[PDB]
From a paper:
In common with all reported high-affinity binders, these peptides incorporate a signature p53-derived interacting motif comprising F, W and L residues that respectively dock into discrete hydrophobic pockets in the N-terminal domain of Mdm2. The Mdm2 and Mdm4 N-terminal domains that bind p53 share considerable structural homology, and there is significant interest in the clinical development of potent small molecule and peptidic dual inhibitors. The p53-degrading function of Mdm2 is enhanced by the structurally related paralog Mdm4 (also known as MdmX).
Residue numbers in the entry:
A (entry chain C): 17 to 27
B (entry chain A): 18 to 112
Write the structure that this text describes.
């Protein structure tokens, strides 16, 4: 995978 | 991944970024880096700018986000590039 997960990895 | 210490860095978004943050309900002028990243992620999801099939792709040529990042699209996997683009749009408090 989700956008949420990709962004959470970025965070 | 932004380091634990860097996540709590207090920052003041420049005007275009601040406008973006307020459009998804942010209500102050000063934030931690962590908070900025929460609201940015939320913004992208609210505007449905991610590709549904490969969800690391963000398209922003016709959006406010493209104006402030200065790019037509990007990949969420480009961690350094994203941090660079975000830091261009804020002032670190006391720097």
């Amino acid at each position: 995978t989700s956008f949420x997960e990709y962004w959470a990895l970025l965070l | 991944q932004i380091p634990a210490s860097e996540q709590e860095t207090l920052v003041r978004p420049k005007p275009l970024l601040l406008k973006l943050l307020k459009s998804v309900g942010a209500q102050k002028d000063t934030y931690t880096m962590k908070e900025v990243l929460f609201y940015l992620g939320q913004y992208i999801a609210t505007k449905r700018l991610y590709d549904e099939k490969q969800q690391h792709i963000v398209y922003c040529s016709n959006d406010l986000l493209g104006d402030l990042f200065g790019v037509p699209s990007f990949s969420v996997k480009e961690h350094r590039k994203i941090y660079t683009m975000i830091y261009r749009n804020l002032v670190v408090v006391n720097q």
